[PDB]
């Protein structure tokens, strides 16, 4: 009787079985529709990307919120039938949602699961809350940076405090994009989507967050200590210097991207400040980093330094950056749905048939 765990990210969908330490499938959150309409009706994930030249590629969860439900149903259908090789009518399904998800969207997720997929039971959990659970905490603040969105989520005993949730439309996608722009200074010309994929790999392997940006910039200007080599697929070898820490610097200095937003450190502080003074000690002492974009070496120390400069002088600040933080949302879901104490929390079909989609509000 295995529960399913589905983490629908702005960039990658992570799916698998509750009780497992890792998702069985990780695939891009893209739907491909034929341009000519004359052979399959739609393509999802890796297959959609491999046929990009003949399909209209769709990103239905671009910034964490679903903008197209049909595209969403297609992603879910592909997850069950192609990726996990399951019949959704045989399993309780745990779905993840973005923080501050509109009430109408939570209802659509619920309706689609019971009506389109005939799930015997389901549940909708906030991604950030699942990340906190993965680290064995029920109170704390999560900095979740993924592909198309970053959120700072204060949590008190499992409840995400909505008035205190902040969102930045700045994450991995923007950093990869910035890196392509700054790599032109080296005569490099990364423009094609396949070249965008190479740059994302350079970002994931050689980028890091400087403890002191100003100092780091001086070091790279004064020496060749920070220069790193990278071998391209063709066989050609390129060098990357200050671009290694300049691209992730945009998380702390959104003006580098031409954005007026406050950096990730100030956003975390603004979220703590929106909460009652009595729990701030619990927030500062439990700062949980989540998502692929928080994977940068040096990010935890930089957050510790930045937060220390903003926090009351007497405040103990603790940054928790697990090495598996790229999949912590999924891991938290796996823990949650496989817990004995969670079994009475599921929304059953019986309950749904009696109440309609509105049941998600009272239950999730």
């Amino acid at each position: 009787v295995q529960a399913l765990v589905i983490d629908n990210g702005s960039g990658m969908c992570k799916a698998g079985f509750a009780g497992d330490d890792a998702p069985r499938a990780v695939f891009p959150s893209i739907v491909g529709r034929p341009r000519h309409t004359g052979q399959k009706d739609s393509y999802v994930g890796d297959e959609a990307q491999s046929k990009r030249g003949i399909l209209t590629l769709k990103y239905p969860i671009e910034h964490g919120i679903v903008t197209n439900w049909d595209d969403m149903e297609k992603i879910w259908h592909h997850t069950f039938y192609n990726e996990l090789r399951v019949a959704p009518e045989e399993h309780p399904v745990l779905l993840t949602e973005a923080p501050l998800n509109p009430k109408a969207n939570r209802e659509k997720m619920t309706q689609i699961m019971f009506e389109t997929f005939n799930t015997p039971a389901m549940y909708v959990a906030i991604q950030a809350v699942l990340s906190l659970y993965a680290s064995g905490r029920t109170t704390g603040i999560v900095l979740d940076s993924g592909d198309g969105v970053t959120h700072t989520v204060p949590i008190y005993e499992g409840y995400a405090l909505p008035h205190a949730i902040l969102r930045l439309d700045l994450a991995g996608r923007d950093l990869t994009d910035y890196l392509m722009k700054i790599l032109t200074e080296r005569g490099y010309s990364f423009t094609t989507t396949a070249e965008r994929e190479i740059v994302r790999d350079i970002k994931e392997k050689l980028c890091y967050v400087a403890l002191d940006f100003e100092q780091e910039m001086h070091t790279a200007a004064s020496s060749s200590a920070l220069e790193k080599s990278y071998e391209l697929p063709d066989g050609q070898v390129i060098t990357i210097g200050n671009e290694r820490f300049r691209a992730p610097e945009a998380l702390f200095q959104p003006s580098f991207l031409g954005m007026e937003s406050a950096g990730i450190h100030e956003t975390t502080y603004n979220s703590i400040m929106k909460c009652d003074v009595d729990i701030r000690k619990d927030l500062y002492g439990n700062v949980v980093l989540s998502g692929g974009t928080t994977m940068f070496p040096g990010i935890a120390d930089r957050m510790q330094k930045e937060l220390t400069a903003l926090a009351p002088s007497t405040m103990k600040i603790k940054i928790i950056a697990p090495p598996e933080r790229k999949y912590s949302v999924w891991i938290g879901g796996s823990i949650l749905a496989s817990l004995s104490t969670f079994q009475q929390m599921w929304i059953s079909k019986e309950e749904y048939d009696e109440s309609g989609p509105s049941i998600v509000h009272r239950k999730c």
């Binding site: 890792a22 905490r137 029920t138 891991i331 817990l339 104490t341 009475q344």
Partner: peptide, 20 residues
């Protein structure tokens, strides 16, 4: 006690997950 309090407590305890 409260079903939610028992859940919270089991989450804090943590658990082993099956290696895949």
């Amino acid at each position: 006690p409260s079903p939610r309090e028992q859940l919270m407590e089991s989450i804090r305890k943590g658990k082993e997950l099956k290696q895949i």
